[PDB]
Coordinates of C-alpha atoms in Angstrom, one line a residue:
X1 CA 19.8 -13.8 -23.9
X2 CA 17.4 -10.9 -23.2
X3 CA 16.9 -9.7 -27.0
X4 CA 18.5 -6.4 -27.7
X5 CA 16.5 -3.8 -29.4
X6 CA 13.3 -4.1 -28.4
X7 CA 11.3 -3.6 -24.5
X8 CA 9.4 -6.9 -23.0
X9 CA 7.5 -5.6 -19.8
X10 CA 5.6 -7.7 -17.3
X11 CA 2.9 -7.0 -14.8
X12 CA 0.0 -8.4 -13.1
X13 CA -3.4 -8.5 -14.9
X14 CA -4.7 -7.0 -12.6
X15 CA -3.7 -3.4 -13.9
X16 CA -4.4 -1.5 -16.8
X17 CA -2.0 -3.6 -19.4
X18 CA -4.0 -2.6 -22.0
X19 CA -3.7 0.9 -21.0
X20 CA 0.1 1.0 -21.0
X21 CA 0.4 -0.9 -24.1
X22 CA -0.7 2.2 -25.5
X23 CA 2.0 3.5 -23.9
X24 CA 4.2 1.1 -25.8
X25 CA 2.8 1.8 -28.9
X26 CA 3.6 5.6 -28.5
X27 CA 7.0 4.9 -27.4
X28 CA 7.7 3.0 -31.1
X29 CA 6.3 6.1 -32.9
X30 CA 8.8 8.0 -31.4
X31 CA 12.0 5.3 -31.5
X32 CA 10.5 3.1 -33.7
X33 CA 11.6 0.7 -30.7
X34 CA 8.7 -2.2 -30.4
X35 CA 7.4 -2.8 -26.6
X36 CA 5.4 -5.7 -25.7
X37 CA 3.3 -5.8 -22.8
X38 CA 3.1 -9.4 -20.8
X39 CA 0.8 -10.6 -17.9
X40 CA 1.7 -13.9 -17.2
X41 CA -0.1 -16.1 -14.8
X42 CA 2.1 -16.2 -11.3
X43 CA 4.3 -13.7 -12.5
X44 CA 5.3 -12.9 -8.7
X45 CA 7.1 -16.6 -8.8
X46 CA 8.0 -16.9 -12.4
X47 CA 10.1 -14.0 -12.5
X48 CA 12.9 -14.7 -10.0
X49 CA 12.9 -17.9 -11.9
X50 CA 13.9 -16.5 -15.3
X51 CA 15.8 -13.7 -14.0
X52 CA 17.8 -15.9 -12.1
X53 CA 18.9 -17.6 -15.1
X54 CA 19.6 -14.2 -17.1
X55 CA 16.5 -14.5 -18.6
X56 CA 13.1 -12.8 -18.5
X57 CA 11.6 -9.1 -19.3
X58 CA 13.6 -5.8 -19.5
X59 CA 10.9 -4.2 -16.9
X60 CA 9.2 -5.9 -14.1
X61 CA 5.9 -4.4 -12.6
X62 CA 5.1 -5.4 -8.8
X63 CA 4.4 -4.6 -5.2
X64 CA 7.8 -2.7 -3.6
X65 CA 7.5 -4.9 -0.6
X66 CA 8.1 -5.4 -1.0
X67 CA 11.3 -7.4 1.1
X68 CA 14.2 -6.6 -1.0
X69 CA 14.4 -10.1 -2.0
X70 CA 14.5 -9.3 -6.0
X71 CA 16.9 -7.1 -4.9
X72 CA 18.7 -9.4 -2.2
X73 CA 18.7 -12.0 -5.2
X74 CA 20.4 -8.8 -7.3
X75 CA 17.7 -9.4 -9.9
X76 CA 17.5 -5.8 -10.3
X77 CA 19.6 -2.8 -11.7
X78 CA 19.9 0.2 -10.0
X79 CA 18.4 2.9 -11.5
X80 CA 19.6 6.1 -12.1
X81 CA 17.3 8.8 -12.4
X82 CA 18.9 12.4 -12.3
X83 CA 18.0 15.0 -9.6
X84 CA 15.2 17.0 -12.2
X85 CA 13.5 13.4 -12.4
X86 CA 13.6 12.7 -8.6
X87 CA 12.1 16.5 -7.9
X88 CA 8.8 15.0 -10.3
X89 CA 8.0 12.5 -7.5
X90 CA 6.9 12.5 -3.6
X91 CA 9.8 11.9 -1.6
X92 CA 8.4 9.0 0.4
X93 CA 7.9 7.0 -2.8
X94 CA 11.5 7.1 -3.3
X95 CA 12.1 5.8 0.0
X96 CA 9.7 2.4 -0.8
X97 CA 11.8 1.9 -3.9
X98 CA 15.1 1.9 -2.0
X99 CA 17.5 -1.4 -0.8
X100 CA 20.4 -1.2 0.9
X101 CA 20.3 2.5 0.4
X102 CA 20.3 2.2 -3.6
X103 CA 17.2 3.0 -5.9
X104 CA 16.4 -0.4 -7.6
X105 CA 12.9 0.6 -9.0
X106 CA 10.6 3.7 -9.9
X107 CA 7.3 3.7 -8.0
X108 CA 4.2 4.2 -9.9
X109 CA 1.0 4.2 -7.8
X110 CA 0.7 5.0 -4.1
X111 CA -1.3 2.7 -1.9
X112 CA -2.8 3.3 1.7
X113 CA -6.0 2.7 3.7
X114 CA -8.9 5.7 4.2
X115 CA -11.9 5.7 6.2
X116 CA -14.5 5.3 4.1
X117 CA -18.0 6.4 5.3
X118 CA -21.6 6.3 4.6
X119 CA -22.8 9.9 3.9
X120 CA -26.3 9.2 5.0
X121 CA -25.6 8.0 8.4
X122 CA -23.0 9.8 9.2
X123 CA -22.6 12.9 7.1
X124 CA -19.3 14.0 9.5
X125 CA -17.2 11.4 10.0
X126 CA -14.8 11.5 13.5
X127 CA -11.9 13.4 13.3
X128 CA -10.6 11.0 16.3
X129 CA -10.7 7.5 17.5
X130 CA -12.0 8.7 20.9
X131 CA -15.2 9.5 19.6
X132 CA -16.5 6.3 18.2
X133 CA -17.6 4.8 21.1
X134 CA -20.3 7.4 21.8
X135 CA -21.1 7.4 18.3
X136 CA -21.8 3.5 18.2
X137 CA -24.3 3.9 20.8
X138 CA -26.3 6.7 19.0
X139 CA -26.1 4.0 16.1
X140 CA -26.7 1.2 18.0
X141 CA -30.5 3.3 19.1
X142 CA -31.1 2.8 15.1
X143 CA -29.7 -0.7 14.8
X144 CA -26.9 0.1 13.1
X145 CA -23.0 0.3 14.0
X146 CA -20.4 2.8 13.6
X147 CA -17.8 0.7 12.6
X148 CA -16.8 -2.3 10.5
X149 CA -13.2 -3.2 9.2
X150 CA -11.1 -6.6 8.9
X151 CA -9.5 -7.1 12.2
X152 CA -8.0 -10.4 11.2
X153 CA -4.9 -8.7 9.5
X154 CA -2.6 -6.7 10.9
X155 CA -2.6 -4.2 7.9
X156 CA -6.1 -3.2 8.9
X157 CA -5.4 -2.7 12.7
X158 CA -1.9 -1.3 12.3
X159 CA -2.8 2.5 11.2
X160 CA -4.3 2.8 15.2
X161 CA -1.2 0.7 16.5
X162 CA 1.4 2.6 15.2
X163 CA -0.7 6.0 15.6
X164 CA 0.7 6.7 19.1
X165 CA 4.3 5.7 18.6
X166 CA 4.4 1.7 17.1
X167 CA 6.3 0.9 14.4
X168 CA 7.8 -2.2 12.6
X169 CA 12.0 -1.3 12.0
X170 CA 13.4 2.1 12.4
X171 CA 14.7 3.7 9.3
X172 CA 18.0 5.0 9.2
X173 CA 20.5 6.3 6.4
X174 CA 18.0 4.4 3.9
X175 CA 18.7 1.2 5.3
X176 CA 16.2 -0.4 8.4
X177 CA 17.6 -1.4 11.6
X178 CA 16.4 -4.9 12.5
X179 CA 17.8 -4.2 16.3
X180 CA 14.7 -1.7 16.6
X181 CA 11.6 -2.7 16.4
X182 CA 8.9 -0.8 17.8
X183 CA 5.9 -3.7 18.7
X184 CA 5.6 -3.3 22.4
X185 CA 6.3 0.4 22.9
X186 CA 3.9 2.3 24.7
X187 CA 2.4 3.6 21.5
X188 CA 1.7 0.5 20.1
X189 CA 0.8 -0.7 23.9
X190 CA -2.2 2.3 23.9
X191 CA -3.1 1.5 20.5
X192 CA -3.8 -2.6 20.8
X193 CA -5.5 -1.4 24.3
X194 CA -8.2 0.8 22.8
X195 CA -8.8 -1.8 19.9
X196 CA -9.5 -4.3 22.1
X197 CA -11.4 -1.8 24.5
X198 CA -13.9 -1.1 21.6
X199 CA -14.3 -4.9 21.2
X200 CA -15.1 -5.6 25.3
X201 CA -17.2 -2.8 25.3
X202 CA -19.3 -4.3 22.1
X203 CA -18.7 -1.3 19.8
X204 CA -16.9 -4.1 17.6
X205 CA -16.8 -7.8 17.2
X206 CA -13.3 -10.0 17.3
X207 CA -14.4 -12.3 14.3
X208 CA -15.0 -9.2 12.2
X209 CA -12.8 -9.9 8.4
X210 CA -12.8 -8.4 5.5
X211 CA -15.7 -9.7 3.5
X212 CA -18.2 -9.8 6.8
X213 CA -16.9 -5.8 7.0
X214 CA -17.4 -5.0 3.4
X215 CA -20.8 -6.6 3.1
X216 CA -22.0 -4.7 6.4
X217 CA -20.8 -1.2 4.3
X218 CA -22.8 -2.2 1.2
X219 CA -26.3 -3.0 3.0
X220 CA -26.0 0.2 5.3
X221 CA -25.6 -1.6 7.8
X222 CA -22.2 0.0 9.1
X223 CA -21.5 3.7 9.1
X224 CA -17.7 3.2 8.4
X225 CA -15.4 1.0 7.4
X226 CA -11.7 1.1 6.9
X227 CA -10.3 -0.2 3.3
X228 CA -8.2 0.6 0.5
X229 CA -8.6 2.2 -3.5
X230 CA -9.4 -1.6 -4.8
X231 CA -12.6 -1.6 -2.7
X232 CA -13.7 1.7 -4.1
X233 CA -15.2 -0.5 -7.1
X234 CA -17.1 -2.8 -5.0
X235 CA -18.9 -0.4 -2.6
X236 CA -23.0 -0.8 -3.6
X237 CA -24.0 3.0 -4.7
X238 CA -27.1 2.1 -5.8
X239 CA -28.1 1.8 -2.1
X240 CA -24.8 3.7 -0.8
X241 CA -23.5 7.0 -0.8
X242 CA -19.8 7.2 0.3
X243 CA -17.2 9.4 1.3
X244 CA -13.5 8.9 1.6
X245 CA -11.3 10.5 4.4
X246 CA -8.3 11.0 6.7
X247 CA -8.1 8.1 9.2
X248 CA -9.3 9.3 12.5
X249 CA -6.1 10.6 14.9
X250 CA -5.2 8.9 18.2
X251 CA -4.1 10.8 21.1
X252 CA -4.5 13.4 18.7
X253 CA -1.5 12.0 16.3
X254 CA -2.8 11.0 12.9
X255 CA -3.1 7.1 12.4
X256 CA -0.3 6.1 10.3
X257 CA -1.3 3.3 7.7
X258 CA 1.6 1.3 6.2
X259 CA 1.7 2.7 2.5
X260 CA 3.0 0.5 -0.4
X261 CA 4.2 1.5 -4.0
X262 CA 3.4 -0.6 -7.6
X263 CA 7.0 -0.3 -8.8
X264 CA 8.7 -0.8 -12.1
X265 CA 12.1 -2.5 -11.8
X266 CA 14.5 -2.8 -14.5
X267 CA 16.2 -6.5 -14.8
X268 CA 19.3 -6.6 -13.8
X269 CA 20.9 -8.7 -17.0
X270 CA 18.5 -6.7 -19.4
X271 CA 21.0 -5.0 -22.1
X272 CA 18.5 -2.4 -22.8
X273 CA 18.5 -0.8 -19.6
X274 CA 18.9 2.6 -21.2
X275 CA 15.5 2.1 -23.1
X276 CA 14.2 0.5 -20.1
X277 CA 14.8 4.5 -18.2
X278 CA 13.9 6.4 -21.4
X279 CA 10.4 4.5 -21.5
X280 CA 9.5 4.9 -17.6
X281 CA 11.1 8.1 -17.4
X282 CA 10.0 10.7 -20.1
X283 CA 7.1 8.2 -21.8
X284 CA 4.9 5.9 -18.7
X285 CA 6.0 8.5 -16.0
X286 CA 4.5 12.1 -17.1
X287 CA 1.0 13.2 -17.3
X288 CA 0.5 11.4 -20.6
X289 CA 1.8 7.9 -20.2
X290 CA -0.4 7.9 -16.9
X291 CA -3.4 9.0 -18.0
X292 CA -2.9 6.0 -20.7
X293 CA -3.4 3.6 -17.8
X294 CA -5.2 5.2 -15.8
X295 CA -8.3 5.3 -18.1
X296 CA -7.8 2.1 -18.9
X297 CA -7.5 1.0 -15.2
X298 CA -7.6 3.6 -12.7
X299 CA -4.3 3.7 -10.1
X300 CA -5.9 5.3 -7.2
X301 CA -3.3 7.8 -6.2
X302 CA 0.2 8.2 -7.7
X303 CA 3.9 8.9 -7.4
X304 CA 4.0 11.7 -9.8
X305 CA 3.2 14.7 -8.3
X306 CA 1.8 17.0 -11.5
X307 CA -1.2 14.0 -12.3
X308 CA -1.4 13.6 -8.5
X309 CA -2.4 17.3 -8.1
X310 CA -4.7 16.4 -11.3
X311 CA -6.3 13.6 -10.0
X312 CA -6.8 14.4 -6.1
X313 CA -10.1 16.7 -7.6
X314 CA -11.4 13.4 -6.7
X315 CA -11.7 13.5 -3.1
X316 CA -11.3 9.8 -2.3
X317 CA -7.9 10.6 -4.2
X318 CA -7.2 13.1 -2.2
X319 CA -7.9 11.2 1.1
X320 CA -5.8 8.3 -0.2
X321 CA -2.6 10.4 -0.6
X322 CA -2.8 12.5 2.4
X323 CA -3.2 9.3 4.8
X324 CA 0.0 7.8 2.6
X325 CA 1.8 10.8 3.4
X326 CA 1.4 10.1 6.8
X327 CA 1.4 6.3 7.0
X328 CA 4.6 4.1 7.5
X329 CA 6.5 3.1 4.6
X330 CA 6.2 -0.8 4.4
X331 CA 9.6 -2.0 5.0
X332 CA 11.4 -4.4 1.9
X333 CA 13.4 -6.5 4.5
X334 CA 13.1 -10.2 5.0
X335 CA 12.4 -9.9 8.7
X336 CA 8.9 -8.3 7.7
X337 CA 8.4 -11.7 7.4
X338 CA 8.7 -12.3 10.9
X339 CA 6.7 -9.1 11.8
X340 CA 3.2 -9.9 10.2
X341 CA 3.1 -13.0 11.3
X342 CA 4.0 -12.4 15.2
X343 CA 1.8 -9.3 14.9
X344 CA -0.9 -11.1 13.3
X345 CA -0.7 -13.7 16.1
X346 CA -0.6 -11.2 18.9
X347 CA -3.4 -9.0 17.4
X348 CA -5.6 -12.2 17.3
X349 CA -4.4 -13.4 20.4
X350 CA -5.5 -9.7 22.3
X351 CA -8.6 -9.6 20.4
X352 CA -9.6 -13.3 22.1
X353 CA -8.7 -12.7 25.2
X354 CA -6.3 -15.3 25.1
X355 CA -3.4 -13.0 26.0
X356 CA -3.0 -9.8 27.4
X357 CA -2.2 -6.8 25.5
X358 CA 0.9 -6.4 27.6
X359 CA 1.8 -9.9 27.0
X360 CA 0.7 -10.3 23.6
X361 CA 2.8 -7.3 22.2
X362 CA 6.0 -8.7 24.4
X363 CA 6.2 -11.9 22.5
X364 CA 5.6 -10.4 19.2
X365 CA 8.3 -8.2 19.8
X366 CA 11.0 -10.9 21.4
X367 CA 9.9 -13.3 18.2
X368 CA 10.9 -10.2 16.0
X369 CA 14.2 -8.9 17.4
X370 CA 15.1 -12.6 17.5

């Protein structure tokens, strides 16, 4: 039995823990309620495990996707924040947090890929996708390239995909329709055609991953590269100087990345659910409680719009949100399963040469429907 009286909260060490143990220890000035803060090794397996049993934390930190499934499993409460509350946040973050149609977490930090450029090489970075081929060959004069990102996964490749009209499951009344997937449109068609155009024309190579991309950025050896806020911390700037910006549009529509929430969820046989709201609501979730953590660990860009506004004066921040609010929301279903790994395959598969765009997209779209 979940002990009564008291908040047990799990997340990844990966964040700031310390930082919102803080926010704990504020919390039991105020209440005199104690809050421990966990991060247990594998916690993404460990807690369906406990909370199957009825067991485990009152709050749950993790990744939206993010496919429902602690909410499929009904491991989760539905929360119930009241309209004032809901105003305090950007509406798309609502939507990453949603199952079914029902609010079974409260998002926390925003996530989404930028293009990230050297300001040395290229002190104005493309505005369109069109215009990086030229700009490769007026690189190529000085031995460098214009462009350098992981091409392996299909989050990478995805924002140029879905730019001109792809997209994974339509969203209707707050729940996704697996009967509409949008892999082999003519959107995503144009947008797998000019990838793989950049690589036949040599502006980019097929075996380009992450860590060959992100090493090619540090030595100056790339102008730009395409990452996310966790890479911000591993860019060289003793040798590099770096800007963050909008992704470049496509046929003149922006790309859209797919954009992911950290969420806190409250378990669903906790019997201090009403703490558990008090705590995120009016003590992690205001300016305060996420400065806490976020000068502890910094969150990139967040949910909340009044220390969003605050913290976009940092323009990689600002970048970050303003490519989430135009990026896809990463679906919570479990027939995303299906979609990264049929996409991944046909990506790879046009990239090669081994199948034809046309083809490639076809089959990852009959796998998915199926």
């Amino acid at each position: 039995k979940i002990e009564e009286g008291k908040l047990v909260i799990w997340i990844n060490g990966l964040f700031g823990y310390n930082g919102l143990a803080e926010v704990g220890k504020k919390f039991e000035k105020d209440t005199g309620i104690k809050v421990t803060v966990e991060h247990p090794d594998k916690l993404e397996e460990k807690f369906p495990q406990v909370a199957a049993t009825g067991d485990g934390p009152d709050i749950i930190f993790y990744a939206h996707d993010r496919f429902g499934g602690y909410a499929q499993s009904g491991l989760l409460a539905e929360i119930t924040p009241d309209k004032a509350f809901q105003d305090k946040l950007y509406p798309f973050t609502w939507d990453a947090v949603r199952y079914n149609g029902k609010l079974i977490a409260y998002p926390i930090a925003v996530y989404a890929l930028s293009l990230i450029y050297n300001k040395d090489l290229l002190p104005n970075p493309p505005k369109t996708w069109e215009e990086i081929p030229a700009l490769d060959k007026e690189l190529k004069a000085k031995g460098k390239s214009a462009l350098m990102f992981n091409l392996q996964e299909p989050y990478f490749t995805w924002p140029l995909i879905a730019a001109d009209g792809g997209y994974a499951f339509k969203y209707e009344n707050g729940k996704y329709d697996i009967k509409d997937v949008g892999v082999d449109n003519a959107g995503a068609k144009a947008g797998l055609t000019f990838l793989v155009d950049l690589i036949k024309n040599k502006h980019m190579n097929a075996d380009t991953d992450y860590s060959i991309a992100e090493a090619a950025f540090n030595k100056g050896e790339t102008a730009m590269t395409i990452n996310g806020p966790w890479a911000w911390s591993n860019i060289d700037t003793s040798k590099v100087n770096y800007g963050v910006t909008v992704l470049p549009t496509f046929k003149g529509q922006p790309s859209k990345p797919f954009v992911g929430v950290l969420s806190a969820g409250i378990n669903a046989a906790s019997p201090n659910k009403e703490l558990a709201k008090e705590f995120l609501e009016n003590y992690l979730l205001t300016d305060e409680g996420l400065e806490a953590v976020n000068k502890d660990k910094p969150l990139g860009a967040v949910a909340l719009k009044s220390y969003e506004e605050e913290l976009a004066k940092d323009p990689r921040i600002a970048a970050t949100m303003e490519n989430a609010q135009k990026g896809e929301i990463m679906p919570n279903i479990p027939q995303m399963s299906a979609f990264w790994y049929a996409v991944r395959t046909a990506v790879i598969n046009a990239a090669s040469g081994r199948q034809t765009v046309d083809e490639a997209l076809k089959d990852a779209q009959t796998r998915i429907t199926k």
